[PDB]
């Protein structure tokens, strides 16, 4: 396969000097356009895609509310917070205050607080919701329902 590319590259006509520099400039422009296109990241709204600073970790202070923020390629990862409130319906069986077996579920409507999202990613991650709600919901369900009779 390499020899085929060899022959194809060789067979390019030996044109006058101008088109060689023209091809070089075209390659330059193509690379520059590709870099400019790539400097922006996958971006859904409901996701405060913050600046992941390469050095020092997440930008605990750079809290990207709704706004352009260009990721330096190979330097910043788009942190796609699902700040879309992801409701999480979660069941928790309960022994109530008088301790009747009461099963209560709870649909819990969590958005990762924008004003602490970068710390939230040093702290929770992208599936922060499965990392917080699944059991704090059951915590609170149980705590409350165990303070009332049947």
């Amino acid at each position: 396969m390499a020899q085929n590319l060899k022959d194809l590259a060789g067979r390019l006509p030996a044109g006058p000097r101008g088109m060689g520099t023209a091809l070089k400039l075209l390659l330059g422009a193509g690379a520059v356009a590709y870099g400019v296109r790539e400097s922006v990241f996958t971006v859904e709204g409901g996701h405060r895609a913050i600046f992941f600073n390469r050095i020092g970790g997440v930008q605990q202070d750079t809290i990207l509310a709704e706004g352009l923020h260009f990721r330096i390629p190979w330097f910043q990862y788009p942190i796609i917070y699902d700040i879309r409130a992801r409701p999480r319906k979660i069941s928790s069986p309960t022994g109530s205050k008088d301790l009747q077996m009461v099963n209560i579920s709870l649909r819990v409507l969590s958005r990762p607080n924008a004003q602490e999202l970068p710390s939230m990613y040093q702290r929770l991650g992208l599936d922060y919701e499965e990392r917080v709600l699944p059991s704090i919901v059951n915590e609170v369900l149980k705590s409350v329902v165990a303070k009332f009779n049947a």
Partner: protein, 68 residues
Amino acid sequence: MAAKVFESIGKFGLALAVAGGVVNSALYNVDAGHRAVIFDRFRGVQDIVVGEGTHFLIPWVQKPIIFD
């Protein structure tokens, strides 16, 4: 001379088609009674209420979520 005209017109047509495709992809219809929320992943969900209105959503950044 003719072949150069052919090639230039073709390049212009391809560029026009690409631009039209991008422009079409940059628009959304959140029917009324559904006030939209910009699904911007640059800086997030807009406390600035971008409700009903086919506001120019940049592609790859703002997908229209239709909130009734």
